[PDB]
Design a protein around this ligand. Structure first.
Ligand SMILES: Nc1ccn([C@@H]2O[C@H](COP(=O)(O)OP(=O)(O)OP(=O)(O)O)[C@@H](O)[C@H]2O)c(=O)n1
Ligand SMILES: [Ca+2]
Ligand SMILES: [K+]
Length: 430
DNA sequence: ATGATGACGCT
DNA sequence: AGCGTCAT
């Protein structure tokens, strides 16, 4: 009862750019705006692989990982933009730079955790407290939340989407206790007003639209963000959790989309997150380990403590390329040449990073996949990264991997390589 | 023949 | 260290 923590101590948001690479290419090329369009990498094999899809193209069934030639079967008018290719590999620099535009706007409002090229978590607790003092108890207008959905409302005793949105928002605001400055529901609402402001600024200053979730922790914020996409934000209160989780497949919760989530389902014989509440913490720890069991016990009640880490820059900087099918690398010369190509792009990004961010990497990790290995990495070895020089870095990578060559011939490479990966890690300030 | 990254857990 | 998991 009175001692039972409810995980309502923080306001956390997750911001996710809608069809990010598509928005970048549509900003650059107005002919792509408001059209079914997709972003593709490479082109010779089956038209290239689709990596991002506009909402207009998704209505036709186009998805990520589709070959562009197949996507054109679903959507003959599909417009395509191609990822830059440099040194024979995809080069994502345009999207990384657009991402920096967005993250630097977000950092004005609060400290952010870069979660991916196009997602950041925001810890808003402190900004909320401040804005609450600026309010002095005045009600929060629905005009301050023009794109906000309150998950689970409307409820109780119109047939259009926006009318539903406004109805739920009104019920929520009508029930708010704007007098109590430590009300969790009030704090989430203020958090949502701030996130509206953040999203307005991102759109004004970059042209890019995003969705967001606002809740009390990262898992609920991420789940919230996915509930109303694109160009909308969703508030998931602590009170909404029982109904939301009662039909929510377990695999939808961040970190449960893989083998652990499958084993939760199979060992416990359940399907939905809320069903987890019927097990004791010790039962869950017995099945899934002490850490996982504690996490699941708290999470299925809507409680999570993973902090928004203050980290706006990636921790490692890497370059990778796959060599599928008949293109697998089968000679010494081939392996060396592609290691040089990867290392040249890596040198370029590292030099940029050292100038921009005042740091230097100190370890080089070299990862390969061999033909027939189902695993995504067959081997990983490290060496010292002492100078930002592509020829040295590629020579060192070759050195640390060369005894993997089975061939008795000095010039051949067996088994052939289906993946090369260079990653610079262990950054020190400079 | 999805392909390009990136973080973190386990041992 | 080196591998496995999960994600965007
Ligand atoms: N299997 C995946 C999924 C995502 N990404 C990377 O993560 C970025 C954002 O992924 P995601 O948010 O899932 O896709 P969006 O295009 O942004 O679509 P949405 O509107 O649903 O956010 C992609 O552009 C891509 O760079 C990737 O490389 N491989
Ligand atoms: Ca996105
Ligand atoms: K994303």
């Amino acid at each position: 009862g009175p001692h039972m923590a409810t995980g309502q101590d923080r306001v956390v948001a997750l911001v996710d750019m809608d069809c990010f690479f598509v928005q970048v290419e549509q900003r650059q090329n107005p002919h792509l705006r408001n059209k079914p369009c997709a972003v593709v990498q490479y082109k010779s094999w089956k038209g290239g692989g689709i990596i991002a899809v506009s909402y207009e193209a998704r209505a036709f069934g186009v998805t990520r990982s589709m070959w562009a030639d197949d996507a054109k079967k679903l959507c003959p008018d599909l417009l395509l933009a191609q990822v830059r290719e440099s040194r024979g590999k995809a080069n994502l620099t345009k999207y990384r730079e657009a991402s920096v535009e967005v993250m630097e706007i977000m950092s004005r409002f609060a400290v952010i955790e870069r979660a991916s090229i196009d997602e950041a978590y925001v810890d808003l607790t402190s900004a909320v407290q401040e804005r609450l003092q600026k309010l002095q108890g005045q009600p929060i207008s629905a005009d301050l939340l023009p794109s906000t959905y309150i998950e689970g409302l409307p409820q109780g005793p119109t047939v259009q989407k926006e009318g539903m949105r406004k109805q739920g928002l009104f019920q929520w605001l009508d029930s708010l206790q704007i007098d109590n400055l430590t009300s969790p529901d009030l704090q989430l609402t203020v958090g949502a007003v701030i996130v509206e402001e953040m999203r307005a600024a991102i759109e004004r200053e970059t042209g890019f639209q995003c969705s967001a979730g606002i809740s009390h922790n990262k898992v609920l914020a991420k789940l919230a963000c996915g509930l109303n996409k694109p160009n909308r934000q969703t508030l998931v209160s602590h009170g909404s959790v029982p109904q939301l989780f009662s039909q929510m497949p377990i695999r939808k919760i961040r970190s449960l989309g893989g083998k652990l989530g499958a084993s939760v389902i199979e060992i416990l014989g359940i399907e939905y997150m809320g069903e987890l509440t019927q097990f004791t913490e010790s039962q869950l720890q017995s099945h899934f380990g002490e850490k996982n069991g504690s996490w699941l016990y708290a999470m299925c009640r809507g409680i999570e403590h993973d902090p928004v880490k203050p980290r706006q820059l990636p921790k490692t900087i890497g370059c990778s390329k796959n060599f599928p099918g008949k293109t697998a690398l089968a000679t010494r010369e081939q392996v060396q040449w592609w290691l040089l190509q990867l290392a040249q792009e890596l040198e370029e990004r590292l030099t940029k990073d050292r100038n921009d961010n005042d740091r230097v990497a100190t370890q080089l990790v070299v990862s390969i996949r061999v033909q027939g290995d189902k695993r995504l990495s067959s081997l990983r070895r490290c060496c010292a990264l002492t100078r930002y020089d592509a020829h040295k870095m590629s020579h060192d990578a070759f050195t640390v991997i060369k005894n993997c060559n089975t061939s008795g011939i000095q010039t051949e490479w067996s088994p052939p390589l289906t993946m090369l990966f260079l990653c610079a890690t262990k950054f020190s300030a400079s």
